[PDB]
Amino acid sequence: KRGKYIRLSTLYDLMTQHWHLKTPNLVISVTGGAKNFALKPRMRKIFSRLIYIAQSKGAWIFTGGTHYGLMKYIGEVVRDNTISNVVAIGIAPLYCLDNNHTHLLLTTEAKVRTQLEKYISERVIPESNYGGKIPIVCFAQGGGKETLKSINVAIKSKIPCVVVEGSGRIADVIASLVEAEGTLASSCVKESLLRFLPRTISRLSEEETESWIKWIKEVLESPHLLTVIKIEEAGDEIVSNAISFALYKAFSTNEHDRDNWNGQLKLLLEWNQLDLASDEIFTNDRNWESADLQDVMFTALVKDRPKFVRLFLENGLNLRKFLTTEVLRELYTNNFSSLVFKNLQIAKNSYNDALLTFVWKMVEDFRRGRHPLQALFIWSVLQNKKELSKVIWEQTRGCTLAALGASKLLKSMAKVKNDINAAGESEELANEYETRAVELFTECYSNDEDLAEQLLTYSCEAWGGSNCLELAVEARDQQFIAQPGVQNFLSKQWYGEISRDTKNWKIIMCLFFFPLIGCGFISFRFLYYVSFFTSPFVVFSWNVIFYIAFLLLFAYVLLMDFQKEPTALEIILYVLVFVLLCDEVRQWYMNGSKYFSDLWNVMDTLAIFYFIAGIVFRLHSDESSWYSGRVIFCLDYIVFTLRLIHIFTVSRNLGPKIIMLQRMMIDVFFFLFLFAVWMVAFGVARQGILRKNEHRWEWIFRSVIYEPYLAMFFPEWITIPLVCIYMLSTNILLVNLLVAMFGYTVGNNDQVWKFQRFFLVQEYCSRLTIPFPFVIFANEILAWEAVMKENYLVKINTKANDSSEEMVHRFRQLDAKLSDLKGLLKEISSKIK
Amino acid sequence: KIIMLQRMMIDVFFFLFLFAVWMVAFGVARQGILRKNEHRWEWIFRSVIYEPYLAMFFPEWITIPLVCIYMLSTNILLVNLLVAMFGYTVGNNDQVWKFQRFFLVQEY
Amino acid sequence: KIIMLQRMMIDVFFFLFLFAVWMVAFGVARQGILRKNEHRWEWIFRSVIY
Amino acid sequence: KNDINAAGESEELANEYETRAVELFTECYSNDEDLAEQLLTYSCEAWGGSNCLELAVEARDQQFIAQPGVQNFLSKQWYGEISRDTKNWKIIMCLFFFPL
Amino acid sequence: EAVMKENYLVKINTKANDSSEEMVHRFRQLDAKLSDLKGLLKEISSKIK
Ligand SMILES: CC(C)CCC[C@@H](C)[C@H]1CC[C@H]2[C@@H]3CC=C4C[C@@H](OC(=O)CCC(=O)O)CC[C@]4(C)[C@H]3CC[C@]12C
Ligand SMILES: Cc1cccc(COc2ccccc2C(=O)N(CCCN)Cc2cccs2)c1
Ligand SMILES: CCCCCCCCCCC
Ligand SMILES: CCCCCCCCCCC
Ligand SMILES: CCCCCCCCCCC
Ligand SMILES: CCCCCCCCCCC
Ligand code: NA
Ligand code: NA
Ligand code: NA
Ligand code: NA
């Protein structure tokens, strides 16, 4: 729709006050009305990165606004960036106008264009990044007389830097006449420009062709205003590597900023020029006190310059002193994206955990109003700052802990389906913090194990309120828990103070004979009995041994005993069931109404509440309910044995088979549910066909459920589709049987069961450490892993060997060596003349 | 197949052991419900083991949780059957049985 | 599991079809061996299936 | 099956147009999702008379449809105007009690 | 998506890095550099004769 045009033969105020904003940058593309322009894949990429740079910095792009070649391509990339701001101001047998430039200002036109861009270079700006002065860059890529005087009237009149590149007619000439000092090279303009564009010279006079030598040689009077985008730069970020190096040349060669090292820094920080700021600013010949490196640091954090945050820290900057109380609150509401904070609302409400509630409250108390480094780390983790958060992680104190808390915080924010691009990136970043915490902890465990396991259970000083183990189970970090350091820790927490090298049977035979513990039979690590009978392998072995002897005594009570009076056997049957209930109520904490959602732990409570009702029917003294108190004991005897069968089932397949099992358990429960649905519908069909048509009660609703199980434990033409029922009901129920068989397969497999073997054993170790009959009777290590982190960061940094075998340093280290041989060849010719 | 077999042999022996445990508990429940309440000997301890195999070779509200036993005892015993089937899979596979084929033949 | 299922559904339907073919041939063999040798109707073609 | 050399080449060229349409659409879905899903159901101005989704099911283009952009589109077409972040049980208990 | 296609064609075109690491340009860019050194060796012999 839009596009403004002004016929023209003082100007700048009629477009910054009436129309639009201010310029942090200003690019000049000069080709002129070249009706042909060979757009390669390279030149299509150079002038597409350039408009993205002008989109980022907010520049004006002055060019000739006619619909030909580059200037129609520059215009159509501008509307591509307004589809996915850029102000492409245009100034111009006959050319047609370009319908893609934002403002039009239409040979005869290249004087008002110069005297405008020479005025914007003249300005003084109180924002003052480039010493004020509004950075002007002039590109050049093609040939002709017009683009030659455009480089002239830029460089000669004022100081805008000019960038050329080696693909074109005369921009390849000046790309060849800059790697040469020949005392201005008075006729090498003729020795160039003819052998690389031979048809333009035989179209005009000699006195103007020599004027082109006068044109070119006054460009080269200042080679600090001439950057060349060379051809071998086959990579991204080479336009901004040339624009910033052109702006750094024109700024630093003002002969006024010798005391102004900071203005060179903020320029080289806005562009991502790390390898230029390291060797031209931080070289210890320049005098800085590392005290004014703080406002430059706060800009390196908010604009996401991760390589500059790392450079400021390794040149001396105490990040603990820098992160004051108000810098964190100029960072959590000023520089916090609201799309993440809106996504932080949905994660806190829909998938709520204990870590998120600390994170949601610590985001809030900074946007409403002490571990400062671990607040900057969460700030750069929530916003998916991929490489800034890797710099702050290396400065934290609890580094294995914060690598797991970040890996949990991202894994919860990637459970939100509000945007699967942000939820796909943060899941990917969480999978490389869990990997970051594996290989840091295997570095900690390759040192002494007593310190690395001191670190697993560190009290966190309220990081999230949990140690590294608790923060890894809730994140379901299967790679952190399947590592051999954590598995060795759990197998020592389960074997207890008994050594794991004694034997397996040697522990069991000490239960049946107590005086074998006091000898040198077991090789544990004065009253070793309180150490033997507190290890949860012995507590589990005694509880199963007690539970079998409880079932062999409940079998004697049921058959031989139980005449009419609850004699001395049946009273202690309450007391053994009472400690099977007293431990359940003391484990009835931490349930959340989801502990009973597994059909083997609600079965435990429903086996006692179906047994307590057997003590109710016991103490009624009538034969009509004494026998009803026996059939509810005999039915409950099978429930107590299936729990023993389930204990033997889990404790034998506690390994690689614990994933196949307990997935097949809920797959057979679904088949038995579908079989119960079919037996109900078979019961209605069998009751509706047979007799007693209308003679009914609530007899029916209690028989139809059970009549097919009593059936388990007129043929006119309907008998043939009765078989088609038994060819359909057999098919849909056998498929549910085979889905139960093979459903464990479909759906890295070592870390799946090692997480489950960890999660089940730590669930049992979180019970009481005393056996069944006796339930009624009841910053020095953070400094160590800071050493272990620096040893680890050396490992991953010197793994750049297959990138060191990429010889891009060796492809160019002999270019300096062949030019060392080149220049000595030339000067020895000058002596013998 | 010498790794699949003899791993499935000790996996079916565990299922038959758990089935024998369940048939013992089914025998106590069937003997305790039926008659001959207090008229006993060592007749009981030798019959309860065998009465369910002779069974293999008042409904007030307890009959519905009797089916929930046959929906639990079927579940925990069929899982032990399928663990016996598929337990050979979980756990370079050519050198596992070539060691066992060597170890059995050198044992003979 | 939606690929394992509905591939096993048409694989059990083929087994139940082959089982129905075998039960038909078992019905002819059991009817031809037992009595009522030549005393027949369309009683036979509706019983041998069942 | 008239010539399995020409039928082996055109199957190979079809498998790299489906791949050409996966990685173009994941580029479209790494930008805003409301425009990429505007594009899945484009009325084609009679290209073949069908959108990108209808032209991918009949081709059995399993790689175009298993990509996370198309799976996220369908899980929004199935959850409807309900957000997928509510809960699973939270939707069901509103059927039994309309004022929730 | 015409904008989204041109962003995509940039991705697959600049994936020629393992073919750029094939140094067939670098095997011949020094042949012009060694011949730059070669011809200057020959003409300096012609001056001292
Ligand atoms: C007639 C009765 C009283 C004598 C038979 C005694 C057994 C019924 C008891 C004593 C030894 C017990 C076992 C001791 C060692 C094993 C293996 C153990 O599993 C592991 O060691 C896994 C390692 C880990 O979890 O890290 C779990 C308990 C279990 C099955 C116990 C289950 C029941 C057992 C066999
Ligand atoms: C009927 C009934 C009701 C309550 C308690 C019991 C006694 O149960 C045990 C006996 C011996 C050892 C451990 C237990 C025992 O508590 N487990 C079973 C352990 C193996 N899955 C419960 C659980 C622990 C971890 C997850 S589940 C029996
Ligand atoms: C790990 C093997 C354990 C064998 C059982 C020990 C003997 C138990 C019975 C002792 C009376
Ligand atoms: C009409 C009954 C057809 C026979 C059913 C055989 C099913 C066998 C299931 C074994 C897993
Ligand atoms: C209550 C009995 C339900 C039927 C049990 C079917 C089990 C089939 C096992 C075949 C491997
Ligand atoms: C996804 C879990 C849904 C649970 C069922 C909700 C309750 C249904 C019964 C309400 C009377
Ligand atoms: Na059936
Ligand atoms: Na069946
Ligand atoms: Na059974
Ligand atoms: Na069974």
Characterization of this structure:
This is part of a larger assembly, with 5 copies of chain A. In chain A, about 50% of the residues lie in helices and about 5% in strands. With about 850 residues, chain A is mainly α. In chain A, the strands form 2 sheets. Chain A has a 5-stranded parallel beta sheet with strand order 3-2-6-7-8, sandwiched between helices. In chain A, strands 1-5-4 form a 3-stranded parallel beta sheet, with no helix packed on it. In chain A, helix 5 links the parallel strand 6 and strand 7 (about 160-165). In chain A, helix 17 (about 375-380) runs parallel beside helix 19 (about 400-415), helix 20 (about 420-445) runs antiparallel to helix 21 and helix 32 runs antiparallel to helix 36. At the A-B interface, helix 27, helix 31 and helix 32 of A face helix 1, helix 4 and helix 5 of B. It is classed as transport protein. Keywords: transport protein, Ion Channel, trpm8. Structure of the TRPM8 cold receptor by single particle electron cryo-microscopy, AMTB-bound state.
The largest sheet of chain A is: 5 strands, parallel
Summing up helix and strand content along with how strands pair, one would put the structural category of chain A as: mainly alpha
Counted by DSSP, the helix tally of chain A is: 39
Termini separation of chain A: 69 Å
Bound compounds, each kind once, are: cholesterol hemisuccinate, the ligand Cc1cccc(COc2ccccc2C(=O)N(CCCN)Cc2cccs2)c1, undecane, sodium ion
**Residues in β-strands, percent of chain A:** under 5%
Strand segment count of chain A = 8
The strand order across the widest sheet of chain A is 3-2-6-7-8
The quaternary organization reads as: part of a larger assembly
Helix content range of the residues of chain A, please?
Answer: 40-55%
Shape category of chain A: elongated
Determine the most extensive contact between two protein chains: A-B, 49 and 46 residues
Gyration radius of chain A, to the nearest Å?
41 Å
PDB class: transport protein
Keywords: transport protein, Ion Channel, trpm8
Entry title: Structure of the TRPM8 cold receptor by single particle electron cryo-microscopy, AMTB-bound state
Chains A, B, C, D, E: Transient receptor potential cation channel subfamily M member 8
